[PDB]
Amino acid sequence: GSSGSSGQYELYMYREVDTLELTRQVKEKLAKNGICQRIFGEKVLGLSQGSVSDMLSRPKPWSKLTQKGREPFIRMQLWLSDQLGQAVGQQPGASSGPSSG
């Protein structure tokens, strides 16, 4: 009977989603936890820091996204429920400030 539950991307290979409400749900769940959507994009989604910014700010509809364009949105959809519980516990140790002298 009920057999999957975490809802792997194979559901979304066929069916459509509201990419605007998806990015919304994601942005909220991240904000509710003080997660920088940048580092989420970098690690979880796997995307460049500006590419994911443009994504979450001004997505395209599912109908525009090809399979390679849906990949980050799929990982977004999963992460909502799935949380992708590999591993947590490491910030990016590093920083810089400007200098001129």
Swiss-Prot record:
Biased composition, class Polar residues, residue ranges: 88-95
Domain of life: Eukaryota
Places the protein is found: Nucleus
DNA-binding region ranges: 8-95
Clinical condition linked: Developmental and epileptic encephalopathy 67: A form of epileptic encephalopathy, a heterogeneous group of severe early-onset epilepsies characterized by refractory seizures, neurodevelopmental impairment, and poor prognosis. Development is normal prior to seizure onset, after which cognitive and motor delays become apparent. DEE67 is an autosomal dominant form characterized by onset of seizures in infancy. Later onset of seizures in childhood may occur in some patients.
Role played: Transcription factor involved in the control of neuronal proliferation and differentiation in the brain. Regulates dendrite development and branching, dendritic spine formation, and synaptogenesis in cortical layers II-III. Binds to DNA in a sequence-specific manner.
Family note: Belongs to the CUT homeobox family.
Name under which the protein is recorded: Homeobox protein cut-like 2
Source organism (scientific name): Homo sapiens
Residues of the full protein shown: 887 to 974 of 1486
